[PDB]
Amino acid sequence: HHQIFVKTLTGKTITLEVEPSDTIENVKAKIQDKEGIPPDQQRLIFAGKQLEDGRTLSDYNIQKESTLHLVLRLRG
Numbered sequence: 001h002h003q004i005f006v007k008t009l010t011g012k013t014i015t016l017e018v019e020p021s022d023t024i025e026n027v028k029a030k031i032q033d034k035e036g037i038p039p040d041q042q043r044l045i046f047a048g049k050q051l052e053d054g055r056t057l058s059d060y061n062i063q064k065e066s067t068l069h070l071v072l073r074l075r076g
């Protein structure tokens with residue numbers, strides 16, 4: 001396991017403990033636990049990609065102390 005950072009555009013950093021084989025789905029569930037944001041409303045971005053729920057941290061080459069951007073799904 002290692003840490004990653006999840007950063008909002010309000011300048012807030014969420015630090016998560018994760019494993020390489022964790023899926024984005026699993027990560028969004030953690031973010032829900034920390035910030036109460038429903039996974040269906042979370043958009044995570046890394047390497048300019050909108051990350052897919054079924055892929056893993058390793059799939060995206062996310063590593064120790066990598067940062068992911070977190071923004072909300074734009075409604076309306």
Ligand SMILES: [Mg+2]
Nearest residue numbers: 018019022026
């Ligand atoms: Mg775990």
